[PDB]
Amino acid sequence: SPQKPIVRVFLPNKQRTVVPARCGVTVRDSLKKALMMRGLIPECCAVYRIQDGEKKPIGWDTDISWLTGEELHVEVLENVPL
Numbered sequence: 001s002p003q004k005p006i007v008r009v010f011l012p013n014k015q016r017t018v019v020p021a022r023c024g025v026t027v028r029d030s031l032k033k034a035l036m037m038r039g040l041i042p043e044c045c046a047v048y049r050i051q052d053g054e055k056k057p058i059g060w061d062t063d064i065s066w067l068t069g070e071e072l073h074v075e076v077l078e079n080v081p082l
């Protein structure tokens, strides 16, 4: 059976969108869909994932195919020009 890897990203506002683990693709591109589907932007959003009872912040250049099997969650970095 064709193996399907995904990462379930918990979007802002406690929603979630899953993105198929893209090999050779960064959190940037994968999450780019994730945010954009909600109408949000990866610019003012951060990627975190919970490890041993704690939080580990993720880098946008991180190959998302390592993060397969995990549930992610994005943290809104509110630094708007307001």
Ligand SMILES: COc1cc(OC)c(/C=C/S(=O)(=O)Cc2ccc(OC)c(NCC(=O)O)c2)c(OC)c1
Binding pocket: 004, 006, 015, 016, 017, 018, 019, 020, 037, 038
């Ligand atoms: C890899 O194989 C897939 C098969 C799919 O289908 C057969 C979808 C399908 C996606 S989709 O068209 O359902 C848009 C989508 C997906 C998940 C969501 O939450 C978990 C939301 N949440 C939106 C909200 O709640 O605001 C939106 C896929 O997506 C990556 C992957």
